């Protein structure tokens, strides 16, 4: 039970963070941050400066 609901919640958190980065790139930042890698449920990697 812990494995199933912990894995789902953590990948949900990663999906929320990816959606937030797409909001920041579209609205206010824009090429000051870029998504390098995104594997859904596995990893997210952003590039600044």
């Amino acid at each position: 039970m812990y494995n199933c609901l912990h894995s789902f919640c953590l990948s949900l958190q990663l999906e929320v963070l990816h959606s937030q980065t797409l909001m920041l790139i579209r609205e206010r930042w824009g090429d000051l941050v870029q998504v390098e890698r995104y594997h859904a449920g596995k990893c997210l990697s952003l590039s600044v400066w």
Partner: peptide, 25 residues
């Protein structure tokens, strides 16, 4: 006499949960 349209991503995550954790009767 709704659906907030961020549910595509949640649904793909549900399918990944189905695969990563299968149901067991």
């Amino acid at each position: 006499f709704s659906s907030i349209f961020q549910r595509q991503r949640v649904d793909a995550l549900l399918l990944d949960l189905r695969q990563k954790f299968p149901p067991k009767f």
